[PDB]
């Protein structure tokens, strides 16, 4: 049900130019997984019932950066500031979601559609809305479903964002990559999830919860078997995520 | 703009009977100021914009009791549990606001009108909405005005609740009573505020802020000069406070 705001031609020019510079920067710095995380944690605080939180620029605020769920994302914010300063017309809100869309594209994933127009809001949401890696399916539906308003299908496909990147013991406490090729966006997260625990590879309890839920497990199976299906469902879910509370939510 | 819900006759019987038992209990235990504080801190978390928080029973939850603003109110909650258990039909939400109305009446203050029907909600609001004693007039309008939706007049009159009770260094860190007769509800809070700092009596920076604001100071002056006016404005404000988010807000 989205109705995206009109933005000036100069604004659209800056988007296009920012998108290209983000590709080169993110590729050079090898920081696509951290930028995807930055985009997700920005959006993932949306609560449909109160219409608070969401991808509106607040993650750069030191008070939101201090949320323990956000450990290490100050690095992300810092890395992007010089480039953002080249695009003063853009909202931080738009800039961070664009970086997430680009992070996915330059690691070889699907092209997530992007619509500009998000405004930078003044107040960060309360801490505690992002998911707890130590919990399971009920918790996941509470956060993605009851708060953000995404579907069970969205939960599984977005979990596949872990196909890139790694945990760090000094940030969450968990450690290592989910896949053997953590700078490559593919369906390997699901393939590893199905094969058991491979030495050196990470599985959060929240990942494992997908294997035991009667709705989530068919989806893991479909994605492990069909990367195209994964990419389609991923692109849908990431667009919805990136637009929570925006242009009608 | 209130439209109060219908409640059963058995519910109204329990209100009337609870009101009388609360008088005797609160008088015997000399805990009227702590019960007023309990009622206020229950209500004072309302945010009109999101319609979250407010006098809906959540302060008895250990997670809300743990808010540092609420230090010492677990005592209040404990004191009331035996009596509440005599009125299982009543919501905790109604019971705590009734105790606040009674606390004011048995110390000799105005009769604040009371309407039953508040429901006990499952989730406590985020911490941090209650006012900071170390701040001033802007802060007060942010909390009472922008969040709760009360008037500048309401802020000054409700500040007069400090005419009963005292701070404790092991609860907020501040210490002592605002008045020489802290179990007597009268306009003495304003009279002391005007006379300067009397030895042994407390003034928070938030109290003092009332003296320097061009809207609040006329009100302090009116109340110090006219206790009847104070009681009228107090009764209005406390009813509005006790009904935030309830029966239309
Ligand atoms: C489903 C529930 C989720 C939980 C419990 C969760 C939890 C975690 C944890 C604990 C970390 C490691 C942080 C560290 O120590 O560095 C992590 C990292 C990561 N998360 Fe998730 N996450 C979830 C969903 C998501 C979603 C929906 C996305 C985006 C589509 C995502 C993208 C990532 C990425 C890319 C990393 C790697 C970061 C890096 O390499 O530095 N995650 N998550
Ligand atoms: C206006 C901003 C307010 C601030 C900054 C504030 C702050 C404080 C503080 C710091 C304490 C002492 C807590 C302790 O250490 O025990 C206190 C106590 C108290 N507050 Fe206020 N308060 C405010 C408004 C209110 C309102 C609106 C009411 C109710 C009408 C109220 C009723 C009381 C009462 C009765 C006590 C005495 C409690 C006792 O004797 O144990 N206050 N407040
Ligand atoms: K991978
Ligand atoms: K007094």
Automatic annotation (TrEMBL), chains A, B:
Cofactor: heme b
GO terms, molecular function: heme binding; L-ascorbate peroxidase activity; metal ion binding
Binding site for L-ascorbate: 29, 34, 171
Binding site for heme b 1: 162, 166, 168, 172
PROSITE patterns: PEROXIDASE_1, PEROXIDASE_2, PEROXIDASE_4
Name of the protein this chain belongs to: L-ascorbate peroxidase
Positions of heme b 2 binding: 40-41, 162, 166, 168, 172
InterPro entries cross-referenced by the UniProt entry: Ccp1-like, Haem_peroxidase, Haem_peroxidase_sf, Peroxidase_I, Peroxidases_AS, Peroxidases_heam-ligand_BS
Native source organism of the sequence: Glycine max
CDD domains xref list: ascorbate_peroxidase
Sequence ranges of Basic and acidic residues compositional bias: 116-136
Region (Disordered): 112-136
Lineage: Eukaryota, Viridiplantae, Streptophyta, Embryophyta, Tracheophyta
Chain positions with Pros-methylhistidine modification: 162
Gene name per UniProt: apx1
A Pfam family matched in the record: peroxidase
List of residues binding Fe(3+): 162
Residues of the Plant heme peroxidase family profile domain: 73-249
EC numbers on record: 1.11.1.11
Keyword Transmembrane helix: no
EC category name: oxidoreductase
Alphabetical UniProt keywords: Calcium, Heme, Hydrogen peroxide, Iron, Metal-binding, Oxidoreductase, Peroxidase, Potassium
The family this protein is said to belong to: Belongs to the peroxidase family. Ascorbate peroxidase subfamily.
One GO BP: hydrogen peroxide catabolic process
Signal peptide: none
Top-rank lineage group of the source organism: Eukaryota
